[PDB]
Write a protein that binds this ligand. Structure first.
Ligand code: ATP
Lengths: 198, 183
């Protein structure tokens, strides 16, 4: 059987099945100031002939979640067609979770996953834990590894040893790709004009 | 008017020539007795022939087109194309208009356009509308002294009206409705 691996964040929502759907599908919705305020979904941005001035509706602005509505709409729009073949109980999903995420929000996300989409199985694996498993499989002679995951909205220094992570020497840094993009925006704005917010 | 001048003896046949006939309207644009003005003036042709200035110096005493085809507005049958005389045409317009609004239509009949520069249009419209209209309703004709460009003046005012800003159509709504806007 096939499975659906899902990683999610502020910038990207990477879902993929056992063989294909390898891309940079975003997680946020786009509203065009010109296209009659139409609310686009993750991949529908390609339908926008003018992405200038797109207003971003973000389920995550940083490591943690906000406004479930957007995330559930994105998941529905993704599943509704070729991306996942909406069939629910035929296969299972494996979702990633941040290093230290809202316990309540994450258990409620699992609740929603079990109730509304009713995947026959899902688990609480960590985004860093999956990369740790990948690296361990790549190098079976290794017994301990540190992951520096500098995502577009994440910067995690996560240890892994003996197939277990310790919650003492685990670091996160707020200097992410989104902050870098915003700083470049502000710099260009300040050095070419007094205001620019694309 | 060119055919009238041909009957007279000039016999122009092209616009490059009858540009001066167009200009003749600058002085040969009076009418008093819509029914017999031209005849009564041909009978006593004096101090009414303005003698328009021809290029070749031919100042022949123009005295029949002075009253022929300023009246063609009130008498379309005088030209050959038939229609309600301009006065009765306006009258039929305000008649087909509403009954209550017809009082203000009588009281606020405006005259505008280059052709309305004829000094006699005001008085002749007064007379014809008073003959065609009831006695209770009067005719308060209003011909601006500069009716030549009254349309342009009013348009410029409407454009440069102070608090008229919000009613201008802009690229903002054009980029989402285009010509599908009110039109
Ligand atoms: N002072 C005048 N006396 C008599 N006739 C005139 C006078 N001035 C202009 N005309 C005639 O009126 C015509 C011009 O009309 P006017 O400028 O009032 O409206 P227009 O803009 O020319 O017409 P339209 O509005 O249809 O374009 C000219 O062809 C001219 O022969």
């Amino acid at each position: 059987m096939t499975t659906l691996v899902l990683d999610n964040g502020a910038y990207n929502a990477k879902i993929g099945y056992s063989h294909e759907n390898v891309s940079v599908i975003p997680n946020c919705q786009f509203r065009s100031k010109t296209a009659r305020l139409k609310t686009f979904t993750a991949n529908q941005i390609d339908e926008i002939k003018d992405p200038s001035g797109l207003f971003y509706i973000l389920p995550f602005q940083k490591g943690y979640l906000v406004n479930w509505d957007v995330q559930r709409q994105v998941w529905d729009y993704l599943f509704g067609k070729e991306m996942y073949q909406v069939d629910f109980l035929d296969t299972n999903i494996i979702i990633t979770e941040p290093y230290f995420n809202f316990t309540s929000i994450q258990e409620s996300m699992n609740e929603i996953l079990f109730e509304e989409y009713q995947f026959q199985a899902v688990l609480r694996v960590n985004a860093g834990a999956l990369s740790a498993h990948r690296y361990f499989r790549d190098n079976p002679s290794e017994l301990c590894c540190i992951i520096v995951d500098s995502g577009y909205s994440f910067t995690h220094i996560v240890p892994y040893c003996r197939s277990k992570k310790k919650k003492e020497a685990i670091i996160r840094i707020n200097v992410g790709g989104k902050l870098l993009t915003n700083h470049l925006k502000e710099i260009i704005s300040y050095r070419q004009l007094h205001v620019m917010d694309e | 008017l060119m055919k009238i001048l041909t009957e007279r003896g000039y016999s122009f046949t092209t616009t490059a020539e009858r540009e001066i006939v167009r200009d003749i309207k600058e002085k040969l644009c009076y009418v008093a007795l819509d029914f017999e003005q031209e005849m009564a003036t041909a009978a006593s042709s004096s101090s009414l022939e303005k003698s328009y200035e021809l290029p070749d110096g031919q100042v022949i005493t123009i005295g029949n087109e002075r009253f022929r085809c300023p009246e063609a507005l009130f008498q379309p049958s005088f030209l050959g194309m038939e229609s309600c005389g301009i006065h009765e045409t306006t009258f039929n317009s305000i008649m087909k208009c509403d009954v209550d609004i017809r009082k203000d239509l009588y009281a606020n009949t405006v005259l505008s356009g280059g052709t309305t520069m004829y000094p006699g249009i005001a008085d002749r419209m007064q007379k014809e509308i008073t003959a065609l209209a009831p006695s209770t309703m009067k005719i308060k004709i209003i011909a601006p002294p500069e009716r030549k460009y009254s349309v342009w003046i009013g348009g410029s005012i409407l454009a440069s009206l102070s608090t008229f800003q919000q009613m201008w159509i802009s690229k903002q709504e054009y980029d989402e409705s285009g010509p599908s806007i009110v039109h």
